[PDB]
Amino acid sequence: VDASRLFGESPDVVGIKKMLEKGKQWEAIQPYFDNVVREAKNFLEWSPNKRLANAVTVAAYLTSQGLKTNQVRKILDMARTTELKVKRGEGDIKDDLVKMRYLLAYTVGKATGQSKYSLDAFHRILDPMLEVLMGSPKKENFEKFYDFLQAVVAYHKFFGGG
Amino acid sequence: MDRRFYGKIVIKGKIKAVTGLHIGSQANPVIKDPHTGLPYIPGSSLKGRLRSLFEILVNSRLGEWREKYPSLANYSPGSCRPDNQENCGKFFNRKINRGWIHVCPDYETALACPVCRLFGASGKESNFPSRIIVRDAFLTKEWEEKWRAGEAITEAKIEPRTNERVVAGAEFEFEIIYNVENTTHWRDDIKNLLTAMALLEDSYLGGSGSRGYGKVKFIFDSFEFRPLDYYRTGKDEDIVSIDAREKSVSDILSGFDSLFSEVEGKL
Amino acid sequence: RRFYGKIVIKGKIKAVTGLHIGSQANPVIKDPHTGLPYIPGSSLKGRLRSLFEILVNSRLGEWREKYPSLANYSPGSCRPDNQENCGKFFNRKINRGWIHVCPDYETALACPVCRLFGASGKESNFPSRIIVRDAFLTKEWEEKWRAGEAITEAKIEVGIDRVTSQANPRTNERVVAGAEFEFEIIYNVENTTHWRDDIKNLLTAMALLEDSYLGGSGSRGYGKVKFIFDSFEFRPLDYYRTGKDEDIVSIDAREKSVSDILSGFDSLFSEVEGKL
Amino acid sequence: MTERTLKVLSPLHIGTGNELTPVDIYPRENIIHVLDTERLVNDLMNLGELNEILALLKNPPAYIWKGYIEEFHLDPSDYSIYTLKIHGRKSMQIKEFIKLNGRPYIPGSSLKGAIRTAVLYKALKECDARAVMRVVSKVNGDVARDIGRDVLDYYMSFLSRKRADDLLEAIVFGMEPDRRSKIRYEPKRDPMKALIVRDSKPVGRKHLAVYHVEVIGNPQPIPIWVEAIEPGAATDVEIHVDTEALRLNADYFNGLLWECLKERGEPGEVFEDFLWEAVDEFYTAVMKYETIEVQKFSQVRSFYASLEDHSGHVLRLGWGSGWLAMTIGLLLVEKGYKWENVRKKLGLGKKGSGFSREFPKTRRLADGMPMGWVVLE
RNA sequence: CCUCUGCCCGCCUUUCCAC
RNA sequence: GUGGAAAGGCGGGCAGAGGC
Numbered sequence A: 001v002d003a004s005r006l007f008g009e010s011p012d013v014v015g016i017k018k019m020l021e022k023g024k025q026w027e028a029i030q031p032y033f034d035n036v037v038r039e040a041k042n043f044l045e046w047s048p049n050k051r052l053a054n055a056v057t058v059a060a061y062l063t064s065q066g067l068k069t070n071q072v073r074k075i076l077d078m079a080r081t082t083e084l085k086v087k088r089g090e091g092d093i094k095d096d097l098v099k100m101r102y103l104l105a106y107t108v109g110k111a112t113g114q115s116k117y118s119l120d121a122f123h124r125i126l127d128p129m130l131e132v133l134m135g136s137p138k139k140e141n142f143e144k145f146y147d148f149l150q151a152v153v154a155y156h157k158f159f160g161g162g
Numbered sequence B: 001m002d003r004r005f006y007g008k009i010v011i012k013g014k015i016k017a018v019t020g021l022h023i024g025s026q027a028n029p030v031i032k033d034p035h036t037g038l039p040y041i042p043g044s045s046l047k048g049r050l051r052s053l054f055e056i057l058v059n060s061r062l063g064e065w066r067e068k069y070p071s072l073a074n075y076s077p078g079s080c081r082p083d084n085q086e087n088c089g090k091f092f093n094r095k096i097n098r099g100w101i102h103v104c105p106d107y108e109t110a111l112a113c114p115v116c117r118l119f120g121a122s123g124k125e126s127n128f129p130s131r132i133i134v135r136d137a138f139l140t141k142e143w144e145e146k147w148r149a150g151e152a153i154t155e156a157k158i159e160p161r162t163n164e165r166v167v168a169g170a171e172f173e174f175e176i177i178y179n180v181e182n183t184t185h186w187r188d189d190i191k192n193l194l195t196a197m198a199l200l201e202d203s204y205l206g207g208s209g210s211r212g213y214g215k216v217k218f219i220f221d222s223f224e225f226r227p228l229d230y231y232r233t234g235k236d237e238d239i240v241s242i243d244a245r246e247k248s249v250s251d252i253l254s255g256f257d258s259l260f261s262e263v264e265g266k267l
Numbered sequence C: 001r002r003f004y005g006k007i008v009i010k011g012k013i014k015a016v017t018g019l020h021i022g023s024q025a026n027p028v029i030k031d032p033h034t035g036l037p038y039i040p041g042s043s044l045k046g047r048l049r050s051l052f053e054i055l056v057n058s059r060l061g062e063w064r065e066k067y068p069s070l071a072n073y074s075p076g077s078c079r080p081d082n083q084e085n086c087g088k089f090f091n092r093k094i095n096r097g098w099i100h101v102c103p104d105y106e107t108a109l110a111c112p113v114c115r116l117f118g119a120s121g122k123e124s125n126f127p128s129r130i131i132v133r134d135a136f137l138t139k140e141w142e143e144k145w146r147a148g149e150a151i152t153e154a155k156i157e158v159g160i161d162r163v164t165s166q167a168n169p170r171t172n173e174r175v176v177a178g179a180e181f182e183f184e185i186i187y188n189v190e191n192t193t194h195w196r197d198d199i200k201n202l203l204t205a206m207a208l209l210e211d212s213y214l215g216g217s218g219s220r221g222y223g224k225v226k227f228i229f230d231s232f233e234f235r236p237l238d239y240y241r242t243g244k245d246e247d248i249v250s251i252d253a254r255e256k257s258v259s260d261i262l263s264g265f266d267s268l269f270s271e272v273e274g275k276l
Numbered sequence D: 001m002t003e004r005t006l007k008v009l010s011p012l013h014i015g016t017g018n019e020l021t022p023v024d025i026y027p028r029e030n031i032i033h034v035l036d037t038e039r040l041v042n043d044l045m046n047l048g049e050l051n052e053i054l055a056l057l058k059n060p061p062a063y064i065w066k067g068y069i070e071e072f073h074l075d076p077s078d079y080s081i082y083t084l085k086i087h088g089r090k091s092m093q094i095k096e097f098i099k100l101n102g103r104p105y106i107p108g109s110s111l112k113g114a115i116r117t118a119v120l121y122k123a124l125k126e127c128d129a130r131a132v133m134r135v136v137s138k139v140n141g142d143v144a145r146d147i148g149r150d151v152l153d154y155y156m157s158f159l160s161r162k163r164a165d166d167l168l169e170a171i172v173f174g175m176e177p178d179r180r181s182k183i184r185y186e187p188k189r190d191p192m193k194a195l196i197v198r199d200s201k202p203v204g205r206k207h208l209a210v211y212h213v214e215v216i217g218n219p220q221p222i223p224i225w226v227e228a229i230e231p232g233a234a235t236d237v238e239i240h241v242d243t244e245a246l247r248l249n250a251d252y253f254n255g256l257l258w259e260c261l262k263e264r265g266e267p268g269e270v271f272e273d274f275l276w277e278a279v280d281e282f283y284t285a286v287m288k289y290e291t292i293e294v295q296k297f298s299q300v301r302s303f304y305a306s307l308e309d310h311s312g313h314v315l316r317l318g319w320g321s322g323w324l325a326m327t328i329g330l331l332l333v334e335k336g337y338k339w340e341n342v343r344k345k346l347g348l349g350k351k352g353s354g355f356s357r358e359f360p361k362t363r364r365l366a367d368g369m370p371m372g373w374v375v376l377e
Numbered sequence E: 001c002c003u004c005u006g007c008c009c010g011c012c013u014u015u016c017c018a019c
Numbered sequence F: 001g002u003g004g005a006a007a008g009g010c011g012g013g014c015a016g017a018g019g020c
């Protein structure tokens, strides 16, 4: 089951839900994607379903950990208000992306205790993509993260989180 | 039989959410505009709570008004939860799925009901159309600017669960239009309308409310009459009864027919 | 039949609050190919005709000289006496509802209502003089539908027992508030004596609709439509005969229906008054 | 009455489920300050990056992560509370108070849930000989409440997130028709749906300060930092009962609370008078119960003897009100062994079970004051 | 984040054709 | 010298009741 049923695109999206609800099998199989996503520093380097396939592996890498929702929401309810200003409102959201990276730095500095490797799983994968929005437009090269924004949120409920 | 038209008394003004304001939908979000992402009071939700409070007011007074408004000889104060009849001598005579409501069954019974002539009736065969229309009330202009500049318009309130609420102090624009269809009884229908608004300033609006999510408070800007002559000619020749620093508990108070002397001047 | 010219009015219908014109989880009507909503022409013509018959019904006394055959009706519905063409104003029983439709071509030439919207009766009938086209979305709002935004919403409304506070909710679909439309109304100048009246009456009834509602619930907030004109062009009989772009254009990009009904009626239509 | 103002006699913390990390705080003096990260971070760019996103996520040795703004900059604070205690070496998480625009108010859901505990206590005192006639109508389980014999003596053995109060709230407030269990709660059948309390006016910045709550009951006391309204602040709140909502429901209410109102007179008329007699009998009884335990701190008793000769209605709110003040279990002290097997059934001590100090061991008091006392009138 | 509700009631074509 | 002419899919309906 360890790196055998789980494959690239859509092999074990339905069978890995019972294994995550295990300890040593997911500690080494899901560690390769969390490093390849770190090596995926270019966000829009995947026009196919590679993001949605990697979204299952990252949410499985967030399944055994905590991932409290009250720290999740404010980072992502700010990501909508950037999008709500895309709709003929603004064209430069440069002043808010500094505050967007500050809320994730404030999040990993507040959750102390048994939630270290949880929020550092959160701190690992997104910072290759959270540098990309500064020197890039919004009509491309942000929206593709806005799909992968909720892609990891949803399967994390499906493997038994919340 | 005999629907006429004489004008449209237009009540504008601004709703003040004194406490936080929660009108939900389906982590428990208040309804927002899908376009601008901003909350609003629906006119469906405001016309109901203006009718919820006024029917209960009429529910306690069915004896002493059947000489002023006839066809209240049909009703005795009660409901029809005790026995499944759509129409018996009880005031709440509409099945309306599992919860009863007062709806007169006909045009000419509802022509003399003080409730169903104002908020509108429904019936098999003949039915009676509403006379007030209540637009959906959005945020004002100056609270757009607070949303443009990062001031909070919403907040999550952990109750272990979160009831989101429109943050207190926020203001909405509400427009109420009354259709003058008969000159003999317009005074009552403007008095019975503001009676229903005085009850809303003591009750609440939307959400839990018994935990303090209400305290809605009206701030009037303009009454306008708009006679039939205004529609034929575009000139702004309509009556403007300003009550800009008045309260709903002062307009309907003695101070009413001093404000409404110029609606007489057109009849 | 003495055709002279056609007056075309083009403007944008705008939904300030969420429009809902149903079909029978409660769908607004939609194009069967694009799937985008639209406003019909049956539903916009008949809401103007409705609001204007209620307008004439109140004025069956003042208008007896400017409009002949209005002295044959007393204001009301002929519903009480199940006979058509009695002495009341609403005198044709279509199925169960009583509408003013004049009985005869020589009376409908003299009614303010049936001259503009037309009438049907034995011994011939009067064809309408207007053509209310269907009002599709503008291209700015196709290209928000192409862009992936929403264009309709699903609103949830509940009814509540007033004693027990039992809730039994239902959901209406309605078009998102803000949606701009595009209308076109083509008057037919069959007589040259009354063309100003029929245009002032068509703008009277459009001013009633800006304080009434178009379609759906409206008493609960679903109407609030706003008319925004662009341009009125009168096509002369000779223009069709030759196809040369030689027609009067009254240009008003930003005007209301009250700023055009009397403010510019003789200042903008003065060139239409000239050519007849 | 309307606009029945209150005052504050002890520290009062209404939580919002949020703590202030030390990157939000830099105390330059004995006064403290809440820095604005969104404005300060966006204001420290003009002089320049990715270093702020690296250092705040790192959380190194707080003090230097907030004093590094002192180099070539200063003066970026939001609220600037006061410490009011001998603490703060940052190493703290200040729990913050509920604020609507950075301004502290009292939520009305929190003052209603304290009246509901007082009203539930009065219903279980007076109502076992009458508690069977309530569940005689469409419940059929009152024979189990009659053969045990005052429905409390059954509920200690009936149990023998947590839905422990599910039957006891369904007996005192809302008898349902039927369930998979015996009975359940119906929100449509409740006298407390006529009780309208509203959110108070906002208190003010001058009455808000940080505190240093010490936990006593163990040999090694623990401190918790928190912010709370200082004693002596007075705001105004309006509470009224809508009597018209009771007249419509004279046949539809089915509960023991409704069978406490039909004995004082007209049940839609004495409910507001029953309401405050329930307040000054739950909270004065928990006030006297805490004079038995002397494990605190001396001066605590000099606060409790001074709570008498104080006009108005005294009640608990907030966060420092212990298990004795949020819970029926003040009435469940007189059982003893009937509650001793059930308290270990529910569980308590962790990291097996606390033997002799099972429920009342913790006392959370701020600066030697038993926190959470608000007096209405 | 938990517990009941998650569309009703209607019209469903009417009328015109000059021997 | 048009399978035509006339014909508003609408009237009514608080997403709410308890849950610090």
Ligand SMILES: [Zn+2]
Pocket (backbone or CB within 6 Å): B102, B103, B104, B110, B113, B114, B115, B116, B117
């Ligand atoms: Zn009625």
Ligand SMILES: [Zn+2]
Pocket (backbone or CB within 6 Å): C100, C101, C102, C108, C111, C112, C113, C114, C115, C119
């Ligand atoms: Zn006519």
